[model samples]
Target: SALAQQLPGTWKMDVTSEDGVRTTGQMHIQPKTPTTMDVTLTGTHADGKPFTGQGKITVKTPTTVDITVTYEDGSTATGQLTVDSPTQFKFDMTASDGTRFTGTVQRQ
Candidate 1:
């Protein structure tokens, strides 16, 4: 779980969903346990609406994590985060309705 410790910090995220919405945001990851982290996200949609969410990340391996997020609009999503390097990672998620998002998160 020590590996999860390395992930606590701020990350800049850029995501594009299946519905063609581009959201640019910042996620703040905070240490919650040896194998878990608390996450908060804030961003703006292409249509100018604000985005906000809260989540938790559970470390699965040095390079993999499971994330569950709940948006302000009452939507929930679960995903996997793959660590690519110290500075970046890949994000893949599926919403309750099966909407998917693929993105990249980089250290900020």
Candidate 2:
């Protein structure tokens, strides 16, 4: 209940990778346990490719989380999500092929 209280909402995200791939999306977060959460992401890439993914979040601290996401095309990414405040977050993630993404998320 504590986890649910802290983070159940829709969050908007924008991420850019070193190679210049930009992804803009929104995620719906639902906490399932004190240490686990489920999320769904739907977004579009800079190139106009649309994607959808599901993630499992493992909470490590009140402000730190680890996430693994699997996209529709069967690709995966792993990331660390850091909560900066009740309304903002930052994320760093690496795709299976080594592409890196850094982004900020805002709760709306």
Candidate 3:
């Protein structure tokens, strides 16, 4: 997948579920090393309050990565993200205190 070399960009992420639950966000990826990345996630909460978070990506293989997100509210999430191509990825995460997050990132 040549994942590491294609790491920097803007990604649009979203979560859509039954009963009209929809969450969307944007992520900016920056590299820390050939195998790692620093990313920022931005979006809004259901109440219209804006939210932002920071995360890091450690690519274990061309298509698989371990991701961690530190939210503004002081929660740290441990997760995994998979590269589908240079322009897309899907991630799943669980925070230290029981928050779960899952979404897809697409280059935009």
Candidate 4:
């Protein structure tokens, strides 16, 4: 039943953009199924812009996940996260308009 355990919890994420911006946020993942999860996140941009977003994650494997994030402004970004360990993960995200972001998360 280990894999059945929900990843639904709070996570602290640090994001770095291609333009050299760094921001931090919290993410909540609610598992809808063994392979699917609903996510909500709120964070501030490096320039002090605050944003909230919702997204979904489809777990492709125990260590791999794909996610889509839609911001409050209606722009969306897609990303892939790779679990490096039980408590650490990293991701790379690309916005619809071609902005890129990469980051790491720690379970909190």
lDDT of 1 by residue, 1-108 (tens): 545766789999888999888778898899888888899988887888898999999988778999899999998989988988878889888999998889998999
What are the per-model C-alpha RMSD values against the true structure? 1.4, 1.6, 2.3, 1.7
Q: What are the TM-scores, per candidate, against the unseen true structure?
A: 0.91, 0.91, 0.84, 0.90
Ten contiguous residues with the weakest lDDT in model 2:
1-10
- Report the lDDT tens digits of candidate 3 across residue range 1-108: 377776688889775433345778888889888888898988986678888899898887767888888889886878787877667888677768665667788889
Query: What are the lDDT figures for the candidates, one per model?
Result: 0.87, 0.84, 0.79, 0.82
The positional error of residue 46 in candidate 1, measured at the CA in angstroms, is 2.1
Model 2 over residues 1-108: C-alpha lDDT tens digits? 344566678889888999887788988888787788898888887878898999898887777888899999999999988877778789788999999999988897
lDDT of 4 by residue, 1-108 (tens): 232353678889898889888889998888788788898989888778888999998886777788899989999999987877677678788999898989887889
Tell me the spans in candidate 1 whose CA falls farther than 4 Å from its real position: none
Order the candidates by lDDT, highest first — what do you get? Answer: 1, 2, 4, 3
Model 3: residues with Cα > 4 Å off, grouped in runs: 16-20
- For candidate 4, the 10 contiguous residues with the lowest summed lDDT are 1-10
